[PDB]
C-alpha cells in the first residue's frame, strides 16, 4: 500500500474509533471554552445554580448528538492532512466554480500523475437565497441590529435591504420618495416580492408601489450576494501503486444528521468511491445546473445523506427547491506529514485512561463536563 493510501486508512480507522477526540483539543480546554460560550446566556439576576445546570445539560446533550458541522469536519481533515500552517494558506486560497460539465476539475485531475501525487479537494455547495418579502415599518420600531435578516424594509424615510449577514444596504431613494411609497402601501404585516400577478399584471396602486420597489432592487442586484453556504466536504485522492486504478474518497459531516465518525463507520466513503471520480464530478455538475427540484434533491440526498436515509434526506419539507452551485479548491498532500499529524493525534488519544476507544471517549467527555461546570461556577461565584 502506498503512503498516500495509508493516510486514508488511518484517518478513517481513527475517526471510527475516537470521534470528537480527533480535534486534539484537551478536554479541559474544550470544557472551559464551552463554559465561556454559555456565560452570555445566564441571566445574573436569576437563579445561578439552576441556569448553570441548564447550560451544562444543553452542551453535554450536543456532545452525544450529531452536532458536528460539515465545515468543522472539513477543517479537521485539512488540518490533519496539511498541518496548521499550510491549512491556513489553503483556507485563504480562492474557490473556483465548477464548470458546467465539471471539465475544469476533470482536466486538473487528468493533468496529474496518479502514481506520483496525493490530492485533497475541498468543496463548498451554496444555495441561492434572495429576499422574498418586503416589510413596512415605522422608523420608531426599526432596529437594524435586531430586525430579521434577508428582508427588504420600507420606512417613512429609508428603503433598506438587510442581507444574510446583517449588512444594511440603503437602496437609494430619498426621504420624499420613501414617504410616498410608504403611504402608497397598505397595512399588512409583510408583502411578497415574488407575486407574479402583482409584478406582471399590477392593477392596484399598492401593486405599482411594490413593483417599483422590486425594480429598484433588481436594478442594483450586483451589489449583493444572495448565495449562502449549504454544505462542505472534502475528497482525498491518494497516489496509486503501479498501474492500479485511481480511487477517490469523500469525507463529511452533516449537522443534525451524522458526524464524520458516523460517516466512516457507515463506509459511505467506500460506497461512493465505487462510482468513480468522473461520474461523481458529473453528478456534481448536474447538481449545480439542474432546475428540477426532484433531480436536485435526489443527487443531494444520494451524495450527502446519512447512509440509509437517502430516501428521506431531501423528501417533502426538505426538498432542495433553490438553485445550488458547486465550487472547489485543490492542493497536493505530503503523506509523511499527514501520517505524522495522525500519529501525534493518536499519542494524544493514547494518554487518556480507558481500555477500549469507547472508554477513552467517555473519559474525554467526562473531563470536558467537569471543566465546563467548574469554570462556570468559578466565573459566576
From TrEMBL:
<dbReference type="Pfam" id="PF22193">
    <property type="entry name" value="MvcA_ins"/>
</dbReference>
<dbReference type="InterPro" id="IPR054021">
    <property type="entry name" value="MvcA_ins"/>
</dbReference>
<feature type="domain" description="MvcA insertion">
    <location>
        <begin position="131"/>
        <end position="225"/>
    </location>
</feature>
<protein>
    <recommendedName>
        <fullName>MvcA insertion domain-containing protein</fullName>
    </recommendedName>
</protein>
Amino acid at each position: 500500500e502506498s503512503p498516500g493510501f495509508m493516510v486514508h486508512k488511518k484517518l478513517k480507522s481513527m475517526s471510527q474509533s475516537y470521534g470528537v477526540m480527533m480535534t486534539g483539543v484537551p478536554a479541559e480546554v474544550l470544557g472551559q471554552m464551552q463554559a465561556e460560550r454559555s456565560i452570555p446566556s445566564i441571566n445574573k439576576t436569576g437563579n445561578l445554580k439552576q441556569q448553570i445546570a441548564k447550560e451544562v445539560s444543553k452542551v453535554c446533550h450536543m456532545m452525544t448528538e450529531p452536532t458536528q458541522s460539515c465545515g468543522q469536519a472539513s477543517n479537521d481533515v485539512c488540518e490533519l492532512l496539511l498541518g496548521k500552517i499550510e491549512a491556513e494558506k489553503f483556507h485563504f486560497t480562492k474557490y473556483e466554480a465548477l464548470s458546467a460539465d465539471g471539465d475544469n476539475l476533470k482536466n486538473v485531475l487528468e493533468n496529474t500523475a496518479p502514481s506520483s501525487t496525493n490530492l485533497l479537494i475541498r468543496f463548498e455547495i451554496d444555495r441561492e437565497d434572495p429576499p422574498i418579502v418586503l416589510v413596512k415599518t415605522k422608523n420608531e420600531n426599526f432596529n437594524p441590529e435586531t430586525a430579521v435578516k434577508n428582508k427588504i424594509y420600507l420606512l417613512e424615510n429609508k428603503l433598506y435591504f438587510i442581507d444574510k449577514m446583517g449588512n444594511l444596504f440603503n437602496l437609494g431613494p430619498g426621504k420624499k420618495k420613501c414617504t410616498q411609497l410608504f403611504n402608497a402601501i397598505g397595512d399588512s404585516a409583510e408583502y411578497s416580492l415574488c407575486d407574479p400577478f402583482v409584478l406582471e399584471e399590477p392593477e392596484k396602486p399598492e401593486d405599482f408601489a411594490i413593483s417599483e420597489i422590486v425594480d429598484i432592487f433588481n436594478e442594483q442586484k450586483e451589489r449583493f450576494d444572495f448565495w449562502i453556504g449549504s454544505h462542505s466536504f472534502t475528497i482525498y485522492i491518494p497516489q496509486t501503486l503501479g498501474e492500479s486504478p485511481r480511487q477517490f474518497y469523500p469525507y463529511q459531516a452533516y449537522f443534525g444528521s451524522h458526524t464524520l465518525q458516523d460517516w466512516f463507520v457507515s463506509d459511505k466513503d467506500e460506497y461512493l468511491s465505487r462510482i468513480g471520480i468522473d461520474k461523481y464530478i458529473e453528478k456534481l455538475a448536474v447538481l449545480g445546473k439542474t432546475t428540477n427540484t426532484k433531480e436536485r434533491s435526489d443527487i443531494y440526498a444520494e451524495f450527502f445523506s446519512k447512509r440509509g436515509r437517502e430516501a428521506f434526506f431531501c423528501a417533502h419539507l426538505n426538498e432542495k427547491r433553490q438553485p445550488l452551485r458547486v465550487k472547489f479548491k485543490i492542493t497536493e498532500i505530503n503523506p509523511e506529514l499527514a501520517l505524522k499529524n495522525l500519529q501525534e493525534t493518536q499519542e494524544f488519544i493514547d494518554t487518556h485512561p480507558g481500555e477500549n476507544p469507547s472508554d477513552k471517549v467517555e473519559n474525554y467527555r467526562n473531563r470536558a463536563k467537569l471543566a465546563m461546570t467548574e469554570h462556570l461556577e468559578s466565573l459566576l461565584d
